[PDB]
């Protein structure tokens, strides 16, 4: 048993017709101190998988090293390590899920919430969640922390059920993700303006975008707000 | 020579031989014949079972390891039970932890390493059994030969046990034919039965004498005994 010290906030994701999108900001908070601004919380694994991690950053870095070891170990005595016997998103996840549940069962959790986004070899979209309790679930949209409360509602307006997936494009999906990151910057006190976004597409592969910023913000109405009830000037 | 250097597995002979391993190899030769072969769609095991009396049953020589993998044995059956049990666990571990069916190639490496530890330490003994592993994984049909020296070899077809050279020379001639038997399980089994019969001498293939196993593209590992193999005699 422990307590999280350096923390990452929301990770948000959704699937679209040809793949999956996943995003997370670049902040490592220390309580209410916005301590570290160059923290990458999206971990790519090979060319078909991105793991997004929120929660304790010391644990995130430990999980990061586990994933690098998985790639190394998979390539041992494996002539098809970059072909048929390369790591699938489903393998990455099931491994992580196993670890998360064993650690919670030892009363010593990895204090995180994890979203594994990717595309399987057959072309299928992979999107699944796991957290410090070892709880797992899949949904057309997934998000951690504040993203669950604020991003899912917006993302679910685009993909409300399974049948909305083939109708949704990369452009529409990405715009919806980017809008949600702006909303989280408005209302989450542990969020940063700077974020990373990753697209995994069954045709165009892994597209990793760094150093994105929330743009097109509405603030001008604030000038007209004075007082808290009766004050006029 | 020999006399002085064959007391235990931890001793090299003056010519660099390991006689205890070689004596274990001799247990396989005394074992009843079994054949393996494959095409690009299926892999087949065929075994000649041995009895003690006309009042006794015929010792079963095929063991299922997972839905997509299994093996046949020649030599000490108790040792095959131990090694097949280990293989069952490794297959099982891969599924539970990684949601991944074990590559037949990796199963070969694991058997090699488990056999090797018994050939270098004091007090133990080598395994006194040879195994033919068949399977269908993410790179198609596979057949392996395991010897208790630790050596494991991927082949198109092979045989082990007494008079196994007959079946082996047949397969070495038939190579170009049976490898082309794609999408036809019955014809591969015929070629396996024609091979196993090359090693006969004592008797003919009877209904409770023959045991056959098959795995492939849309075929889980399944064993055939008794009247189920009557159509192949």
């Amino acid at each position: 048993t422990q307590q999280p010290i350096v923390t990452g906030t929301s990770v948000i994701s959704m699937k679209y017709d040809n793949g999956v999108i996943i995003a997370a900001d670049n902040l490592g908070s220390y309580g209410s101190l916005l301590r570290f601004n160059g923290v990458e919380r999206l971990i790519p694994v090979g060319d078909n998988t991105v793991v997004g991690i929120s929660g304790d950053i010391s644990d995130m870095q430990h999980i990061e090293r586990l994933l690098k070891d998985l790639v190394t170990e998979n390539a041992y005595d494996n002539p098809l390590a970059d072909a048929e016997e390369a790591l699938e998103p489903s393998y990455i996840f099931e491994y992580l899920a196993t670890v998360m549940y064993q650690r919670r069962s030892k009363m010593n959790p990895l204090w995180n919430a994890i979203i594994v986004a990717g595309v399987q070899s057959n072309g299928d979209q992979f999107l699944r969640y796991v957290n410090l309790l070892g709880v797992t679930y899949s949904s057309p949209t997934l998000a951690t922390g504040f993203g669950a409360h604020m991003a899912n509602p917006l993302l679910r307006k685009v993909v409300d059920r399974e049948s909305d997936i083939p109708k949704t494009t990369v452009q529409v999906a990405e715009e919806a993700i980017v809008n949600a990151m702006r909303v989280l910057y408005y209302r989450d006190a542990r969020s940063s303006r700077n974020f990373s976004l990753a697209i995994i597409d069954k045709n165009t592969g892994l597209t990793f975008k760094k150093n994105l910023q929330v743009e097109n913000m509405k603030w001008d109405f604030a000038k007209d707000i004075k007082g808290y009830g009766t004050q006029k000037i | 020579f020999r006399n002085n250097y064959d007391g235990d597995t931890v001793t090299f002979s003056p010519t660099g031989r390991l006689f205890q391993v070689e004596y274990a190899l001799e247990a396989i030769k005394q074992g009843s014949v079994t054949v393996g072969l494959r095409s690009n769609t299926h892999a087949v095991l065929v075994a000649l079972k041995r009895n003690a009396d006309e009042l006794s049953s015929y010792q079963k020589k095929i063991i299922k390891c997972d839905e997509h993998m299994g093996l046949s044995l020649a030599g000490l059956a108790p040792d095959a039970r131990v090694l097949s049990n280990y293989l069952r666990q490794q297959c099982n571990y891969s599924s539970l932890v990684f949601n991944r069916k074990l590559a037949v190639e990796r199963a070969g490496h694991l058997l090699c390493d488990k056999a090797q530890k018994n050939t270098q330490s004091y007090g133990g003994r080598p395994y006194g059994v040879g195994l033919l592993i068949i399977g269908y994984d993410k790179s198609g049909a596979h057949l392996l030969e395991f010897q208790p020296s630790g050596n494991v070899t991927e082949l198109y077809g092979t045989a082990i046990g007494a008079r196994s050279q007959g079946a082996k020379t047949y397969l070495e001639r038939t190579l170009d034919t049976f490898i082309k038997i794609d999408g036809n399980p019955d014809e591969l089994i015929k070629a396996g039965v024609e091979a196993i019969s090359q090693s006969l001498r004592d008797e003919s293939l009877t209904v409770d004498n023959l045991s056959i196993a098959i795995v492939g593209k849309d075929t889980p590992f399944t064993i055939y005994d008794g009247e189920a193999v009557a159509k192949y005699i």
Side-chain angles (χ1 to χ4, degrees):
Chain A
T1 300
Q2 38 187 98
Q3 44 171 327
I5 280 67
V6 187
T7 57
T9 189
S10 312
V11 180
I12 70 167
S13 63
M14 67 180 299
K15 43 182 75 171
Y16 60 97
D17 57 17
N18 296 145
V20 305
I21 306 183
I22 186 165
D25 73 10
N26 304 328
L27 181 55
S29 293
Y30 183 82
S32 58
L33 172 57
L34 312 178
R35 198 165 182 181
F36 304 114
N37 284 115
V39 181
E40 182 56 71
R41 306 196 285 114
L42 304 181
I43 316 304
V45 183
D47 66 343
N48 66 170
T49 303
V50 178
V51 183
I53 302 166
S54 63
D56 188 82
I57 296 303
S58 85
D59 287 337
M60 184 186 80
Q61 290 178 355
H62 169 81
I63 288 162
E64 187 159 357
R65 195 169 53 74
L66 289 175
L67 293 168
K68 267 146 188 161
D69 292 18
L70 228 193
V71 171
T72 304
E73 214 89 37
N74 186 65
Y76 286 161
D77 309 332
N78 187 10
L80 314 176
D82 64 336
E84 291 90 2
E85 296 293 352
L87 290 167
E88 293 283 70
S90 65
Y91 311 161
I92 305 307
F93 177 84
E94 202 70 12
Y95 172 66
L96 290 173
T98 299
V99 170
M100 297 308 277
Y101 184 72
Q102 282 178 176
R103 288 289 297 264
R104 94 91 216 191
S105 304
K106 291 282 183 61
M107 295 301 289
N108 181 210
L110 295 174
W111 204 283
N112 298 106
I114 294 168
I115 295 175
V116 176
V119 172
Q120 301 280 98
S121 67
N122 67 351
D124 289 353
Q125 295 95 326
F126 189 91
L127 196 62
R128 205 163 168 81
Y129 170 103
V130 63
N131 72 3
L132 76 169
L133 294 169
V135 174
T136 64
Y137 45 79
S138 274
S139 177
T141 76
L142 287 175
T144 70
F146 269 92
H149 298 100
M150 301 205 76
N152 273 330
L154 299 169
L155 301 181
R156 284 162 181 180
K157 284 159 77 77
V158 175
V159 286
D160 201 19
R161 64 265 311 290
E162 197 83 5
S163 65
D164 287 332
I165 296 164
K167 304 173 188 187
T168 304
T169 62
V170 207
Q171 290 87 201
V172 172
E174 191 180 9
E175 192 189 326
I177 290 285
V178 170
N179 175 247
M181 296 299 292
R182 166 166 57 250
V183 171
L184 296 178
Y185 187 64
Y186 286 143
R187 317 307 292 208
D188 182 6
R190 305 289 175 272
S191 67
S192 152
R193 191 168 176 175
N194 303 103
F195 67 105
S196 302
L197 181 149
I199 304 164
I200 307 94
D201 192 280
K202 74 178 169 179
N203 298 316
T204 59
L206 202 195
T207 306
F208 201 99
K209 302 184 183 186
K210 286 173 169 287
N211 304 125
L212 272 41
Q213 275 210 148
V214 170
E215 305 291 354
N216 305 292
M217 286 193 292
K218 290 199 173 70
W219 287 99
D220 197 88
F221 70 95
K223 76 191 191 294
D224 302 315
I225 301 292
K226 54 263 177 203
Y228 47 79
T230 63
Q231 187 173 310
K232 291 168 173 176
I233 54 168
Chain B
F1 191 73
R2 180 153 162 170
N3 190 25
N4 288 117
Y5 308 91
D6 72 353
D8 36 52
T9 342
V10 83
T11 306
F12 274 110
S13 78
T15 64
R17 299 166 71 183
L18 293 170
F19 282 107
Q20 273 297 309
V21 175
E22 290 188 11
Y23 299 165
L25 259 44
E26 201 62 31
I28 300 163
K29 262 74 80 65
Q30 284 191 135
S32 181
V33 69
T34 174
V35 173
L37 77 165
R38 72 164 188 88
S39 69
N40 286 291
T41 62
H42 297 81
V44 189
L45 289 172
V46 184
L48 174 75
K49 299 185 290 189
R50 185 176 288 167
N51 65 346
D53 283 48
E54 257 53 36
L55 272 41
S56 90
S57 55
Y58 284 81
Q59 185 96 319
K60 45 184 280 293
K61 313 214 305 155
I62 302 174
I63 303 168
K64 181 177 186 186
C65 285
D66 203 1
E67 298 302 327
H68 70 104
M69 202 194 297
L71 82 196
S72 67
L73 65 103
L76 280 170
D79 283 357
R81 172 154 166 73
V82 168
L83 292 175
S84 63
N85 182 257
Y86 179 70
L87 206 56
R88 280 170 168 176
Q89 289 172 325
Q90 289 304 311
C91 290
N92 197 204
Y93 185 85
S94 188
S95 291
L96 295 169
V97 176
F98 296 101
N99 200 202
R100 183 181 192 174
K101 294 170 188 165
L102 191 67
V104 173
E105 190 167 311
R106 187 148 193 281
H109 297 318
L110 292 158
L111 287 171
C112 164
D113 295 350
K114 201 195 206 306
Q116 190 281 150
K117 291 164 190 171
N118 290 228
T119 71
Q120 183 158 212
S121 312
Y122 191 63
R125 64 171 178 81
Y127 290 93
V129 70
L131 304 168
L132 306 186
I133 298 91
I134 61 163
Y136 192 93
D137 58 27
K138 281 200 163 196
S139 74
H142 299 280
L143 165 68
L144 267 45
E145 186 178 340
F146 162 87
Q147 295 294 334
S149 51
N151 289 293
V152 181
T153 316
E154 184 157 353
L155 295 141
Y156 290 117
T158 192
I160 47 167
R163 313 160 197 167
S164 59
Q165 191 59 230
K168 203 163 183 177
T169 309
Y170 167 87
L171 290 165
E172 199 164 13
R173 204 277 170 194
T174 318
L175 183 54
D176 297 329
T177 306
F178 73 79
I179 197 262
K180 291 249 68 190
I181 301 175
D182 293 352
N184 202 170
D186 290 332
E187 281 298 328
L188 250 174
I189 295 165
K190 265 197 175 74
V193 169
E194 192 164 19
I196 197 88
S197 52
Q198 221 68 222
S199 299
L200 294 170
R201 206 158 145 193
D202 179 38
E203 52 170 312
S204 173
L205 303 171
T206 81
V207 72
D208 42 75
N209 189 15
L210 187 65
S211 190
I212 292 161
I214 175 77
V215 68
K217 188 174 175 182
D218 293 320
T219 316
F221 188 93
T222 46
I223 306 162
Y224 295 122
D225 290 310
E227 324 89 67
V229 299
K231 70 261 281 182
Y232 300 111
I233 298 164

